[PDB]
Symmetry: D2
Subunit: 259 residues, 4 copies
């Protein structure tokens, strides 16, 4: 089948990449980075995040696999020493697919949409951050603070976790909203707690005074000017992984945070 390999770009990763291409040379596997069916990422979770965004127009046609050159990754499921075993399994087609939910972000000004695998965040462009938070058209809170983070399930181990969010098993189709440094006093009030939203709920952020926001989607971060609305919902699209063995989410969590 058609495949391609992205590399973190250090010496370790490029050579492991060349090795796998040579190894794939011995099977009915065609290198194709335009219309690949398998996308192998070699590096860290940052490398995997870039591979996902490189091909996010064909998530329906692609199964992703990650090899972590440094520490273990939540998306890069494989060690370098296992590359040859992976080459053989992929060529023989002995793999199941699994899917993770994704987050849709819409920015209205006159409208851009993004897909996130980890999260989308909103901060001010320097001044104070104040937004109205509207859940399914109902005004829920006026948020004052440093910013807001909306995480997918697999994103819950990343920025969301540092903000006090829960870790959510990726079989749950949800998104999680966490606060960054909310102001709470006599007059200003936020919920405080993380909020977990099911599919089809729409969280809308609406400016109060300033209309300029620094918006991040995974690694990408852009200053958006004259914003009327930021809309969050669980995407209809999903990322697909090639899975060759059992590696449960909670085992990845244990291995990454406990030992």
């Amino acid at each position: 089948m058609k495949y391609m390999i992205t590399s973190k770009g250090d010496e370790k990763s490029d050579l492991l990449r060349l090795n796998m291409i040579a190894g794939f040379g011995e099977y009915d596997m065609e290198y194709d980075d335009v219309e690949p069916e398998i996308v192998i990422s070699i590096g860290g979770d940052g490398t995997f995040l870039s591979a996902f965004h490189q091909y996010e127009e064909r998530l329906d046609e692609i199964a992703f696999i990650g090899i972590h050159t440094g520490h273990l990754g939540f998306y890069a499921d494989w060690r370098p020493a296992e590359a040859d075993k992976l080459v053989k399994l992929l060529a023989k087609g002995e793999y199941q697919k699994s899917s993770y939910p994704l987050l849709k972000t819409t920015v209205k000004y006159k409208e851009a949409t993004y897909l996130a695998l980890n999260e989308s965040t909103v901060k001010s462009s320097g001044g104070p951050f104040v937004v109205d938070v509207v859940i399914n058209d109902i005004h829920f809170e006026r948020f004052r603070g440093d910013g807001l983070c909306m995480s997918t399930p697999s994103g819950t181990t990343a920025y969301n976790k540092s903000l006090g969010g829960a870790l959510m098993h990726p079989s749950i189709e949800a998104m999680q909203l966490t606060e960054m440094a909310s102001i709470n006093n006599r007059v200003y009030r936020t919920i405080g707690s993380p909020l977990v939203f099911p599919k089809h709920h729409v969280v809308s952020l609406q400016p109060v005074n300033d209309k300029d926001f620094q918006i991040s989607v995974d690694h990408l971060s852009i200053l958006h000017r004259d914003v009327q609305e930021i809309r969050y919902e669980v995407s209809a699209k999903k990322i697909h992984f090639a899975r060759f063995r059992s590696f449960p989410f909670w085992r990845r969590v244990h291995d990454s945070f406990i030992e």
Copy 2:
């Protein structure tokens, strides 16, 4: 249809109860507190929790309704001044049913099972609290601290919230595990974060030294001796509510915590 009414037992609640019984007297509604089809709770969420546990052997046959005499409740959806309107709607059958997930607790010694609408918690019987946390038979962490709290979705606004858990929309079939005062240092390590579990995941707590635990299920709290295992999973059973109008979960959250 058959119905019964429990009362918080103060003067306000009993009289509102008597009024509704008189009001039901004018329809084809039979008072029956053995095999009721509708269970009306008048009081607070504590009163509603007691009504649920009174009839938890027939959750399949019952739709619950709550009237809050004091502050607004998350389960008691109705104000006293609306009692007469409620009498009329219930008698005419103009109601939809909605369901919330419940938590199953199994205590093995030689085995008791409980159903919780808010949460189940585990603490020691005085000494230090140490348990091994096993997720789907995989050892996840050795927890040291004051205790652990496993919450249903509708429970996430209660004890779970005070422990830093996320609020979860009740359409999500999940349970959430939060830490009470975990010890984390060079040698002792817990995840820290709340954990959200889908249906069919089994969280097992296993003693390390002491085998005596104070276990709570909603309001009930019992000292269990010589415990071998505490098992948590999302129940196959659900609570059913009679719904007569739109009152979204996030609106209940806003009304209860924001204003």
Copy 3:
């Protein structure tokens, strides 16, 4: 004595300012905004913070007073309706002085020093934030995350509080370091907890890769390039307040956050 009055600049504040100047006209009080001995701030705590930084070269010669036009302030101790009573008390000299500790920030490149009344914070200029935290020349932790906040005692009710810091009575000569969204996992480790430092302890932040930082001192926020060190210590300088009645810190905290 010599005095001056700064105003938030809205209609309410300017007119209250003009009234007090007219009122001071009836005593031996000379308006002087170059070498004032009393500095009256009329507005909010933001207005007071600007008054403090306007005159921070003569904190030894000045007693500050604040009038809050909007909500109650932690530094603006007086309501508008009390302005005339304040005019009379100040002119008669019936006031005690009280002092709050201040934070000294040194940025080395080739060295700038700042004084903060609330706090100094450090964030990256966009990329990831990584710094080594050195306490009294001893390497304490490698911090990864969004940033760090060093608060005075009276600052503990502001940004520090939103970050989970403790509130500290201003009679304690200390500074408090809080984390913004620290990354903690198998490999990366921060203390997590706020840290409270006595006088004469020196906390030094040292770059790891990137040398560009966005540094804030109270309201001021500046991009510093090619930074070698950020040094925090409790200042030898203190702010002095004119006090005319009992208004305990914990009462200000109660009034501002509880009711």
Copy 4:
């Protein structure tokens, strides 16, 4: 000088104890566990806490030293392999004394007072926990939740830390109040944040309905019945340590929590 040695009571600790007694036999050092001037604890910080409470009537006459048999301790400053070096230094009198602040607890019914080296905590005897918190005779908050923890500076690394309190350098004469699982909503309000109190401030807890409380002082935990008041203040008494080398507090914190 007069000295005594307490032991954790395992084989390692008793034998290390016997060795030091034999070693002390070669100097002008008299074993005396009634009126000792030096108290050596061999075990963990729990062993040291028991030694402190054994002799808390003569804290003015005693310098404490701790040897940790297991992991490093915050009070047990010495490893077993260094016992002989310690014997020699103590006998030669080559030691400085350092002092840590202590917490005074008064329980009024008709009045008991306790001294804590780590902290004092208050919980209910089973039902809900509700107390009024009075700071220097001013009503500050009505606390609802699981309990409250008042920590000394050296206690801030223990229970206080697990509750989200700040770590405080022990040269600061203060106590820190942290919340256990506070309920915060539309009607119920607590400060949330830890509170740091200077010397001479008096925090008083006063019952609201129930008068029975489980009160802990370091390891001791007792059910107090018919309580009228719990009073917290920084003690006039201090613990004195024999110090033979530099081991800064922040280095102990680094070694215990970072690596």
